[PDB]
UniProtKB/Swiss-Prot annotation, chain B:
This is E3 ubiquitin-protein ligase RNF213. It is found in: Cytoplasm, Cytosol; Lipid droplet. Monomer. Interacts with UBE2L3/UBCH7; UBE2L3/UBCH7 is the most efficient ubiquitin-conjugating enzyme E2 for the ubiquitin ligase activity. Interacts with UBE2N/UBC13; promoting 'Lys-63'-linked ubiquitination of target proteins. Disruption phenotype: No visible phenotype. Males and female are fertile and produce normal-sized litters. Mice do not spontaneously develop Moyamoya disease, a chronic occlusive cerebrovascular disease. Mice are however more susceptible to Rift Valley fever virus infection. Mice show elevated expression of MMP9. Composed of an N-terminal stalk, a dynein-like core comprised of two catalytically active and four inactive ATPase domains, and a C-terminal E3 module. The ATPase regions do not generate movement but rather act like an intricate molecular 'switch'. The RING-type zinc finger domain is required for the ubiquitin-protein ligase activity. Atypical E3 ubiquitin ligase that can catalyze ubiquitination of both proteins and lipids, and which is involved in various processes, such as lipid metabolism, angiogenesis and cell-autonomous immunity. Acts as a key immune sensor by catalyzing ubiquitination of the lipid A moiety of bacterial lipopolysaccharide (LPS) via its RZ-type zinc-finger: restricts the proliferation of cytosolic bacteria, such as Salmonella, by generating the bacterial ubiquitin coat through the ubiquitination of LPS. Belongs to the AAA ATPase family. Transmembrane segments: none annotated.
Swiss-Prot record, chain C:
It is found in: Cytoplasm, Cytosol; Lipid droplet. There is a cross-link at residue 290 (Glycyl lysine isopeptide (Lys-Gly) (interchain with G-Cter in SUMO2)). It comes from Mus musculus (Mouse). Disruption phenotype: No visible phenotype. Males and female are fertile and produce normal-sized litters. Mice do not spontaneously develop Moyamoya disease, a chronic occlusive cerebrovascular disease. Mice are however more susceptible to Rift Valley fever virus infection. Mice show elevated expression of MMP9. This is E3 ubiquitin-protein ligase RNF213. Atypical E3 ubiquitin ligase that can catalyze ubiquitination of both proteins and lipids, and which is involved in various processes, such as lipid metabolism, angiogenesis and cell-autonomous immunity. Acts as a key immune sensor by catalyzing ubiquitination of the lipid A moiety of bacterial lipopolysaccharide (LPS) via its RZ-type zinc-finger: restricts the proliferation of cytosolic bacteria, such as Salmonella, by generating the bacterial ubiquitin coat through the ubiquitination of LPS. Belongs to the AAA ATPase family. Composed of an N-terminal stalk, a dynein-like core comprised of two catalytically active and four inactive ATPase domains, and a C-terminal E3 module. The ATPase regions do not generate movement but rather act like an intricate molecular 'switch'. The chain holds residues 824 to 1197 of 5148 of the full protein. It comes from the Eukaryota. Monomer. Interacts with UBE2L3/UBCH7; UBE2L3/UBCH7 is the most efficient ubiquitin-conjugating enzyme E2 for the ubiquitin ligase activity. Interacts with UBE2N/UBC13; promoting 'Lys-63'-linked ubiquitination of target proteins.
């Protein structure tokens, strides 16, 4: 009977009971020497830092109140210091020490662990800033210098990314995830799926990704903790120079092969971590915090505030064309604005830049790209109302020229024919979500879209999201779309938020399922264009729509999906003439 | 693995509603049969769950046949277990149509569903084809039937007041017992709460004077129209839709040995009118008689205060399981809902005080639903 | 019909006359019902709609396109047009001034802040005209351009020949109150953050050079900028008058040695209201303290590498070493007749050469 919590002596009069309170400083420096005993020279170089780290860890664990940091944190600190001292062959820079302390002793808010660990260590003051983003980048992406030896004892633990309002995955998918996207395991929200079979299939996907060696981003763990705790422990059984860890289902424990480049990230709210996780879990996972203020530099926050002011004066129009009082909110004008959208927009603009050094030639085009992102999802009557707006009349002129000549907002077919001919460099799959007030495409409109994409696309499969109870039917149709021949495929998933169906929390599950099946099923010769068109109303649903999701989703508002054969496709032409000049003959 | 191919080759799922004395858990409803020599092997659902766990987590062969057999087995089993889920919901809601239901499901390629009732007027249903779409359509159909059955039983509980005295299984037991020539003593004593010192002559009078002979004419009309009405549908979903809507509108045409909810409600209201002197109770001086009366007492003075309330009319007889409900942890929602139906429905021939004692002791979900 | 036949912008006098005509017809009529009020509002709305569509008809490009490193308007007599057509007096319960000025900010904020500030001191935004309200529009837009160029890390003033002294003093008041180190909105109350602000930002030494060259720039700032300037000047005087003695906190000493050139510049600006050798003495004493501190931690770790075996009582040094180096340098006693005793009381020079 192994336990982490205490026991009552009525059960341990049967057999032998071994209890240990907490290791004192001599046992801590002995454990550190037992870790570092695998090499002699580096251990006799870095025995000077064992007793400082032990006293500093004891002051940390006595300073805090909840048992947030434990022995795995100190052990991983000693292992990381030992690995840097092995790979360095000169000693420890204070940069190496501050990276080890700040990768290990993070996550807790009311603890300044740098100041505690450099109180006792007054040489290791590092006057330069250390971003959390590069610590996450060197946790996820080690190079060939790391993990190149006999066995793997200098491997990192895993990631636990604590957040507010579920905003880790956007930042991880724009800034961090390079080359090959991970395989997102998530708590699927399709109806009439049983939880047990979904836990089984999620653990199968985790197991396959341990074998092939791609990353895992878990969005649930309170369903998977009983089945993955021995993997989170990172204690391995070696057969043939290959590592095997225990995985369980029900009462079935087996040793599954782990590839030498495997990473796992749990994403979880800060509150749920601080009040629902049992805390062997917090001690196993190398915490960091990344909300939106962590990743945004202060000038980018000033761009966020300036952009919110720009939106609130884009929307607030003062005119008396009709004698009515209806002050427009930027939620009304920009279909998706939810008072947290401009941070997402600025993060999308910076990640579209690729240069990233503040130079007043970059700052201006981040601001213009952010304005372009807002303009790319605005209704056209707002752009017509913009002549009497608080911005001006030349700003409204250039925004209308951008909205009608740079950005394609005519219909769905024109957005395709302008979107396919863009030479997407180093993007094998381009993902765009589209918001509309028209009717969704029927099956006769799909035939017209296929005949009008005769030489460009590859017969767009249109899927309706209400027609899917289980997840496997949706995966069957995505796989049947994927196994068709021809390149430049187009998938169209269709949700409607204004009906009696519940298909408004199905959107994230549909997107995650599609993204996982594309990342595991697509070849390297074919390109993929998945469009998620959602149907909204001007009756208050278009303003209650939570919008600008980042990650790998570009957000557009095409107003009508169907190319009109009646009116001209240019509102400026209708703005020049009047109604009598419309009937003027040749 | 080759066991899973043998399941996907000749395995037969069986929903049976087990005839033994044991309960109606999902562990004892579903079975799986394997034929071969000529022996057979029966698997309960716990061993199929342990084998699926061993097979979802076994080593990757990297072959298309292997993972398509595991996916086919897992999807047929999940849809079949979901059918078990909808079947147990229809059972515990109390139905007496899908009480003696049974279904074999053939996991052969183009194997099909073989469906059967415990009825004499119905025939052996069968349909071949793709198994997953048949289970999906069947489960969607049975979910729509559960919603329609809950709506019909809500509108029978709303128009018959005394049917609200009993839960679902109690109405099933009474409907089985009153059609018998000599009903059981447990049924003839549970009906003492409506009539009082009830006996077999009052009950045979009530079950003779309840239903007319025009119901015989309309059920025979259904019995002659139904053969050329089932054969207008090519598939199984149309035949089941016809059977289910006619079971909604004429229940005793299918079950010629039990009362339906109309005849039960009329029999109870007739038993109610043989024995008179109803109970008239006033509320105390300071309690309004048209709204809730929430009273906060303190834990030692809850059980005396209810006995204070019921002394506003002495010589009126003591309460029973109606008009007082003692709430406690592990109190189901149906007890509270039937008390609220007894307090807020019409035909009652008296004025009675309806009490919820220790109504704070309920759970959060039962409280929200109440 | 007269806005549709002028497209040369030296002919702005003609729509100026045709809007002063509706101004004159409005300013003579009698007030009566609400048909006259809705009539005058509707006619003014249609007149400014025609005016805005004229200005968008012949201004089909930007303002102040540079092309020569001598940034000039591409419609050179543009500011005359705005002065003439904005100054006419409609009743100001309506628009015509909340709208055309909003038009000018939206046309001007289409420009990058560097080119806007370079035009603001280029002798073509001349005639600050005693609350000419388009000039107050331009004052507000240039203060916003200053705020946008100080949210970026671009220094504003390294090419400004801005001999009109009113706008130069207003831009300096802008750069002070919008570059000041806010901490959710202007607390300072200290000396360290203000001093890092002076040493790190490059516009501060140029600011102090140009306001200490002539007293005719400090006379026209604000009420706020002179208190903040007095606080920054008191902080720098307190710190660099504390260099003459040893009372300086050694945090400020590491700061001034990391920031040698800016501190020498500001001090060279301050002598006109020895320093090479005084910096070499303070630098030598700082290097001596840090190398003596490295010896004592190496001694402590060597006796800590034998901590299991034989333990040592470190005199008073066990507490003196634990304290942070926010401590004043006069306690480290660089006396003469030579040695430099510190707060780490090393019990002899024997232990010093041993260390």
């Amino acid at each position: 009977g192994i336990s982490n919590w205490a026991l009552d002596p009525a059960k341990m009069n049967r057999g032998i009971f071994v209890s240990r309170g907490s290791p004192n400083e001599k046992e801590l420096i002995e454990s550190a020497e037992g870790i570092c005993s695998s090499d002699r020279l580096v251990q006799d170089k870095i025995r000077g830092y064992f007793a400082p780290f032990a006293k500093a860890y004891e002051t940390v664990c006595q300073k805090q109140d909840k048992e947030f940091f434990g022995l795995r944190d100190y052990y991983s600190l000693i292992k990381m210091v030992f690995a840097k001292a092995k790979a360095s062959k000169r000693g420890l820079s204070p940069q190496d020490i501050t990276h080890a302390v700040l990768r290990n002793f993070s996550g807790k808010d009311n603890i300044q662990a740098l100041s505690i660990f450099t109180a006792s260590l007054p040489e290791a003051r590092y006057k330069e800033e250390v971003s959390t983003v590069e610590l996450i980048k060197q946790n996820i992406y080690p190079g060939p210098q790391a993990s190149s030896r006999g066995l793997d004892g200098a491997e990192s633990r895993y990631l636990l990314v604590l957040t507010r309002n579920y905003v880790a995955l956007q930042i991880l998918q724009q800034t961090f995830f390079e080359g090959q996207q991970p395989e997102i395991i998530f708590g699927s929200s399709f109806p009439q799926d049983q939880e047990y079979t979904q836990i089984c299939r999620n653990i199968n996907r985790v197991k396959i990704c341990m074998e092939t060696g791609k990353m895992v981003v878990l969005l649930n763990l309170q369903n998977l903790y009983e089945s993955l705790y021995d993997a989170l422990n990172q204690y391995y059984v070696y057969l043939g120079g290959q590592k095997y860890v225990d995985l369980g289902l029900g009462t079935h424990r087996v040793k599954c092969r782990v590839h030498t480049a495997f990473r796992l990230i749990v994403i979880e709210e800060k509150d749920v971590v601080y009040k629902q996780f049992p805390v062997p879990l917090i001690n196993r996972l190398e915490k960091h915090y990344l909300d939106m203020n962590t990743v945004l530099q202060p000038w980018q926050k000033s761009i966020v505030q300036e952009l919110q002011q720009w939106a609130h004066e884009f929307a607030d129009v003062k005119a008396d064309q009709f004698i009515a009082r209806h002050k427009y909110s930027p939620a009304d004008v920009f279909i998706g604005y939810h008072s947290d959208a401009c941070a997402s927009v600025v993060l999308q603009a910076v990640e579209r830049q690729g240069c990233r050094d503040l130079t007043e030639e970059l700052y201006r085009k981040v601001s213009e790209e952010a304005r372009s992102i807002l303009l790319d999802c605005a209704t056209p009557d707002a752009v017509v109302r913009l002549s009497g707006s608080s911005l001006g009349s030349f700003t409204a002129k250039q925004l209308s020229q951008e909205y009608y000549y740079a950005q394609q907002h005519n219909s769905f077919v024109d957005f395709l024919q302008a979107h396919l001919r863009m030479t997407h460099h180093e993007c094998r799959a381009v993902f765009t979500e589209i918001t509309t007030f028209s009717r969704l495409l029927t099956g006769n409109d799909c035939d017209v879209l296929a005949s009008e994409l005769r030489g460009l696309a590859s017969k767009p499969v249109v899927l309706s999201l209400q027609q899917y109870d289980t997840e496997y039917s949706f995966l069957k149709d995505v796989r049947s779309w994927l196994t068709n021949p021809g390149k430049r495929k187009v998938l169209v998933i269709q949700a409607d938020f204004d009906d009696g169906t519940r298909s408004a929390q199905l959107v994230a599950s549909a997107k995650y399922t599609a993204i996982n099946e594309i990342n595991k099923t697509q070849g390297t010769k074919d390109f993929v264009f998945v469009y998620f068109v959602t149907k909204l109303s001007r009756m208050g649903s278009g303003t209650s729509y939570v919008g600008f999701h980042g990650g790998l989703w570009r957000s557009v508002h095409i107003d009508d999906l169907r190319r009109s054969t009646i009116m001209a496709s240019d509102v400026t032409k209708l703005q020049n003439v009047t109604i009598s000049q419309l009937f003027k003959p040749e | 693995l080759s066991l899973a191919t043998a399941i996907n080759s000749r395995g037969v799922y069986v929903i049976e509603a087990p005839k033994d004395g044991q309960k109606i858990s999902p562990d004892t409803v579903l079975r799986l049969l394997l034929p071969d020599p000529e022996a057979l092997r029966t698997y309960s659902t716990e061993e199929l769950k342990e084998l699926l766990n061993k097979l979802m987590l076994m080593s990757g062969k990297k072959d298309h046949n292997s993972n398509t057999e595991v996916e086919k087995f897992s999807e047929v089993f999940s849809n079949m277990q979901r059918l078990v889920h909808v079947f147990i919901k229809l059972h515990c809601a109390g139905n007496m149509l899908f009480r003696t239901w049974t279904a074999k499901v053939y996991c052969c390629p183009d194997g099909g569903i073989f469906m059967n009732f415990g009825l004499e007027l119905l025939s052996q249903l069968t349909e071949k084809g793709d198994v997953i779409q048949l289970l999906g359509a069947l489960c969607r159909q049975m979910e729509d039937f559960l919603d329609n059955w809950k709506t019909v039983v809500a509108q029978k509980r709303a128009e018959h007041f005394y049917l609200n005295f009993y839960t679902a299984e109690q109405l099933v037991y009474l409907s089985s017992e009153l059609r018998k020539p000599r009903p059981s003593e447990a049924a003839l004593m549970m009906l003492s709460f409506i009539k009082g010192k009830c006996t077999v002559q009052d009950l045979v009078q009530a079950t003779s004077a309840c239903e007319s002979k025009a119901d015989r004419y309309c059920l025979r009309e259904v019995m002659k129209k139904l053969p050329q009405q089932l054969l207008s549908e090519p598939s199984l979903m149309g035949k089941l839709q016809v059977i289910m809507m006619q079971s909604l509108v004429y229940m005793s045409a299918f079950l010629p040995h039990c009362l339906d909810l109309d005849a039960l409600g009329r029999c109870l209201a007739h038993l109610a009118t043989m024995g008179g002197t109803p109970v008239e109770r006033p509320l105390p001086k300071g309690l309004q008689a048209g709204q809730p009366n929430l009273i906060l007492c303190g834990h030692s003075e809850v059980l005396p205060a209810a006995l204070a309330i019921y002394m506003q009319a002495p010589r009126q007889p003591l309460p029973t399981f109606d008009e007082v409900l003692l709430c406690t942890p592990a109190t189901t929602i149906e007890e509270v809902e039937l008390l609220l139906r007894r307090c807020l429905t019409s035909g009652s021939q008296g004025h009675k005080v309806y009490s919820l004692l220790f109504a704070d002791q309920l759970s959060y979900e039962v409280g929200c639903q109440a | 019909t007269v806005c549709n036949i002028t497209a040369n912008h030296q002919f702005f006098e003609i729509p100026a006359l045709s809007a002063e005509l509706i101004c004159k017809l409005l300013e003579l009529s009698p007030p009566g019902e609400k048909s006259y009020e809705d009539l005058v509002t509707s006619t003014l709305q249609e007149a400014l709609a025609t005016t805005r569509n004229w200005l968008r008809s012949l201004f089909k490009s930007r303002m102040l396109s540079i092309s020569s490193a001598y940034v000039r308007l591409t419609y050179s007599e543009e500011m005359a047009v705005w002065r003439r057509l904005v100054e006419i007096g409609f009743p100001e319960k309506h628009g015509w001034k909340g709208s055309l000025l909003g038009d000018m900010e939206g046309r001007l904020k289409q420009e990058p802040p560097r080119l806007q500030i370079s035009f603001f001191c280029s002798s073509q935004c001349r005639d600050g005209g005693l609350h000419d309200s388009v000039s107050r529009s331009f004052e507000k837009c240039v203060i916003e351009a200053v705020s946008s160029a100080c949210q970026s890390q671009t220094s504003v003033l390294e090419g400004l020949s801005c001999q009109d002294l009113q706008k130069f003093g207003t831009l300096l008041s802008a750069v002070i109150t919008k570059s000041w180190p806010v901490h959710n909105g202007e607390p300072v109350f200290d000396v360290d953050e203000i001093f890092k602000y002076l040493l790190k930002w490059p516009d501060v030494r140029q600011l102090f050079e140009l306001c200490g060259t002539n007293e005719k720039i400090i006379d026209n700032i604000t009420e706020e900028g002179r208190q903040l300037m007095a606080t920054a000047e008191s902080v720098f005087q307190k710190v660099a008058g504390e260099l003459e003695n040893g009372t300086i906190v050694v945090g400020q000493l590491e700061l001034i040695l990391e920031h040698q050139s800016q501190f020498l510049d500001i001090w060279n600006l301050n002598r006109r209201r020895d320093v090479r050798s005084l910096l070499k003495r303070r630098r030598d004493d700082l290097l001596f303290l840090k190398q003596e501190k490295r010896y004592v931690e190496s001694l402590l770790r060597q006796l800590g590498r034998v901590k299991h075996l034989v333990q040592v009582d470190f005199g008073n040094i066990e507490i003196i070493h634990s304290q942070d180096l926010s401590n004043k340098k006069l306690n480290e006693a660089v006396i003469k007749l030579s040695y430099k005793r510190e707060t780490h009381y090393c019990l002899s020079p024997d232990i010093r050469e041993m260390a």
